[PDB]
């Protein structure tokens, strides 16, 4: 946190001049020349405090004006250290909106990229922990209703075709903050006051209950909205209809992800479709039910009628053109080498939007039927038949390439680390988790690689949940402990790699380390790190992740 881990890019005044004419989604990161995230912009005095910490860094000898943006009202807040002005496309409301939009960007940049392991394309960015920049967690809640009703301007995730007061980046950020900080009583108190003027905000309260471990309280509340005449649904015909579909979607997904119960989950999923047949999530749920119900006939039919996202994209950090201050291995050049032409040119990789989610279901279908039996189903209902939606047909071409690659690999096995990544990601796409974990584990021995580490970490998380769900005494004590140690061993390594590339915040690693914390005490985890690793490394994990769990979780442990 000291001089190092702060990237820089060199004519004076080039920074804001390129930002000034590019004003015409959530927006760009806060420019300082380097970019930065996780700054407490709730108060101008608190900003000067941050700048104070930066100007207290200007001392000593280095070894060779921030500008936050809000999407609610498209204007740029520049503050020079004190000149403060606004760049267009009541005083308290200005700092309020820019703070909320800032927090949304800090969270959604890690949530929209959760599939890619929170990958960071922009190098010159310094990402802080937004929860430890306070209290930011509590401040977001108390400042939420003031910024509510304008959350639609933030649009919605790429998998959401029809945004609303409930489905948007603002609410998605809220439910994520409340879940991580376990601030139930704080958010519940705020939302109940919001319902009084906005009865449709009860849907948000339901999602909070599910996130804060209140299933029964949530289902009891859902039934109240979908049955009781005193609900807000029973009072337009389109604004109210999308609220009903969301409730049905939540209810159906709850029935599916947990509680098994595919039969009852199907009846709710179909009603969700009848409320919003143009929505992706409705058809996406119903397709998952059909797969779970071993009905591959209607699974292909429901997958075909499933609408795709053709315009919207995932949120990423974006003047196009470096100083890299280096803060155990961390060395040499990766890739920049030859690879199997048919292995790296896999079109099934780098799939975006709903097309990626659809491909996962397709691989889940071919896992049961097989490629030969799949063509029998395909030729039966596609060209009393219906036309294929092209994008689905393309996924079949992509599926054939992956199955061929995976089979040609396993037949041969019966390789460079990057080649192990590509095969591992290929096996993961087809749903071969243990065979992919081996590929990632082999590639982890010859070299580090972030892809292998993040994917192998998720493997242990899944292995941990599996044992707890399926559950002698001696087997449990040994299997869990071995997993927990392997989890901690991976979390430390990834966090150290993130710190090298100016990343101090990772929701994946926070959730990952939280798994061990629930098992072994908060103090035991720390000593586990300080034992296998060095003292300053354990201190790093302590500041980035462990300090959040120790205090900023509202005494969860």
């Amino acid at each position: 946190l000291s001089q190092t881990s702060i990237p820089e890019v060199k004519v004076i005044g080039y920074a804001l001049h390129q930002r000034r004419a590019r004003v015409g989604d959530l927006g760009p990161p806060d420019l300082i020349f380097f970019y930065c995230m996780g700054i407490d912009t709730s108060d101008p005095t608190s900003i000067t405090i941050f700048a104070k910490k930066i100007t207290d860094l200007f001392l000593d000898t280095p070894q060779i004006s921030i500008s936050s943006w809000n999407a609610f009202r498209k204007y740029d807040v520049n503050i020079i250290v004190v000149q403060t002005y606004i760049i267009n496309s009541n005083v308290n409301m200005i700092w309020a909106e820019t703070f909320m939009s800032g927090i949304v960007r800090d969270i959604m940049i890690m949530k929209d990229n959760r599939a890619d392991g929170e990958s960071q394309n922009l190098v010159e960015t310094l990402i802080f922990n937004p929860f430890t920049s306070g209290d930011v967690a509590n401040n977001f809640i108390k400042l939420f209703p003031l910024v509510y009703e304008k959350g639609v301007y933030l649009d919605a995730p790429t998998h959401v075709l029809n945004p609303s007061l409930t489905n948007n980046y603002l609410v998605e950020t809220l439910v994520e903050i409340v879940r991580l900080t376990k601030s139930l009583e704080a958010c519940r108190k705020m939302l109940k006051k919001l319902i009084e003027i906005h009865p449709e905000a009860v849907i948000i309260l339901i999602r909070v209950y599910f996130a804060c471990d209140l299933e029964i309280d949530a289902v009891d509340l859902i039934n109240e909205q979908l049955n009781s005449p005193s609900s807000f649904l029973a009072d337009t015909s389109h604004i109210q209809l999308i609220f009903k579909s969301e409730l049905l979607s939540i209810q159906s997904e709850f029935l599916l992800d947990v509680k098994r119960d595919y039969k009852l989950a199907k009846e709710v999923a179909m009603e969700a479709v009848n409320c919003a047949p143009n929505e992706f999530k409705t058809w996406y749920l119903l397709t998952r039910i059909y797969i779970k119900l071993n009905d591959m006939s209607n699974a292909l039919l429901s997958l075909n009628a499933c609408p795709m996202s053709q315009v919207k994209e995932k949120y990423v950090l974006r003047a196009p053109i470096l100083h890299l201050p280096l803060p155990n291995p961390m060395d040499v050049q990766l890739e920049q080498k030859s690879a199997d032409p048919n292995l790296v040119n896999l079109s099934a990789s780098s799939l975006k939007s709903t097309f990626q989610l659809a491909y996962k279901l397709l691989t889940e279908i071919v896992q049961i039927t097989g490629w030969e039996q799949l063509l029998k189903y395909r030729s039966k209902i596609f060209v009393s038949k219906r036309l294929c939606e092209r994008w689905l047909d393309n996924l079949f071409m992509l599926l054939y390439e992956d199955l061929k690659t995976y089979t040609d690999w396993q037949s041969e096995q019966l390789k460079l680390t990057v080649e192990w990544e590509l095969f591992g990601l290929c096996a993961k796409r087809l749903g071969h988790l243990p065979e992919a974990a081996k590929a990632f584990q082999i590639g982890l021995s010859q070299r580090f690689s972030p892809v292998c580490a993040k994917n192998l970490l998720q493997f242990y998380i899944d292995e941990h949940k599996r044992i707890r769900r399926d559950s002698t005494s001696s087997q449990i004590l040994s299997s869990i402990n071995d997993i927990d140690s392997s989890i901690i061993d991976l979390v430390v390594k990834i966090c150290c790699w993130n710190h090298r590339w100016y990343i101090e915040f990772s929701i994946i690693l926070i959730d990952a380390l939280s798994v061990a914390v629930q098992d072994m005490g908060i103090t035991k985890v720390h000593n586990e790190i300080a034992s296998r690793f060095s003292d300053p490394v354990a201190q790093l994990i302590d500041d980035n992740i462990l300090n959040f769990l120790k205090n900023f979780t509202n005494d969860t442990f």
Binding site: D217, K259, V268, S473, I476
Partner: protein, 171 residues
């Protein structure tokens, strides 16, 4: 509401239906007769089916009531723990069979900081190893997906002196 339609293009999958009010409707062929061909006139009679609505309405209420009955209404209860036997340096604690309305138990923790019970449903008894004439307190913490419930704190005083070496079988 009955309207006469003209068949424009007719493919194996879809069809283009044209009205006199210049409406163009893409319509699935399988819902058309077998001898439709192309350039034919079809009579489409659309009527509302109230009895089918009442069937689905009753079905929907049946499903919603079924979900509420299975998940919800039934809540997890009290984590009551009792005292089996107390010695001078150890005591055996037990608890009534855990009753959970809905899944699932996340963790069962003893409080006096103490360890987590490995098999709460199989083994309902725990024996405190290390502890003479010293007051201690215990209480269970039931963390479920339905909510966290801790209650029934129990205090006890260890007995006084008033899976013995000289009384061994080899002594």
């Amino acid at each position: 509401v009955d309207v006469l339609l003209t068949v424009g293009k007719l493919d194996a999958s879809l069809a283009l239906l044209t009205t006199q009010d210049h409406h163009v409707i893409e319509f699935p062929t399988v819902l058309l007769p077998e001898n439709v061909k192309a350039g034919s006139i079809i009579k489409m009679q659309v009527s509302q089916n109230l009895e089918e609505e009442k069937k689905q309405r009753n079905h929907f209420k049946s499903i919603q009531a079924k979900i509420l009955e299975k998940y919800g209404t039934h809540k997890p209860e009290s984590p009551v723990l009792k005292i089996v036997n107390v010695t001078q340096t150890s005591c055996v604690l037990a608890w009534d069979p855990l009753k959970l309305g809905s899944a699932k138990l996340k963790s069962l923790i003893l409080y006096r900081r103490s360890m987590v019970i490995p098999n709460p449903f199989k083994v309902t008894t725990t024996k405190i190893s290390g502890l003479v004439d010293t007051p201690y307190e215990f209480q269970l913490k039931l963390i479920t997906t339905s909510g966290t419930l801790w209650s029934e704190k129990v205090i006890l005083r260890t007995h006084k002196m008033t899976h013995v070496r000289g009384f061994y079988l080899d002594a």
